[PDB]
């Protein structure tokens, strides 16, 4: 399962925070595009928790659907 999120990421430090909340939820394999302000997560975790994880950054997130 490969969900895809929009995350407003200004700086490279902003992208480092996204990979941390993700690494602490565990059980994900992610790839963070900083130019395009996008995250794709392959994870058995529900869309709603993976969503919930990414707004702990303080950054406004949103669900784009699947790839997959």
Partner 1 sequence: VNSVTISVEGMTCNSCVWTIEQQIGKVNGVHHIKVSLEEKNATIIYDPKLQTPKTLQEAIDDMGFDAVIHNIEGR
- List of residues contacting Pt ion (CB under 5 A): 2, 11, 40
Counted residue by residue, the chain has a size of 68
Choose from Cu ion, Pt ion, partner 1, none: what does 35 bind? Cβ within 5-8 Å by kind. Answer: none
How far apart are alpha carbons 36 and 10 in whole angstroms? 10
Q: Which of residues 20-39 bind partner 1 (CB under 8 A)?
A: 20-21
Interface stretch with partner 1, choices 5-13, 26-34, 42-50 (CB under 8 A): 5-13
The whole-angstrom separation of Cα 32 and Cα 19 is 8
Q: Are 44 and 1 in contact (CB under 8 A)?
A: yes
Known binding site: residues? 11, 14
Known binding site for Cu cation: residues? 11, 14
């Amino acid at each position: 399962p490969k969900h895809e999120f929009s995350v407003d990421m200004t700086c490279g430090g902003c992208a480092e925070a996204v990979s941390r909340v993700l690494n602490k939820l565990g059980g994900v394999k992610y790839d963070i595009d900083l130019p395009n302000k996008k995250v794709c997560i392959e994870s058995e975790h529900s869309m709603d928790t993976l969503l919930a994880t990414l707004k702990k950054t303080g950054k406004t997130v949103s669900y784009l659907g699947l790839e997959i």
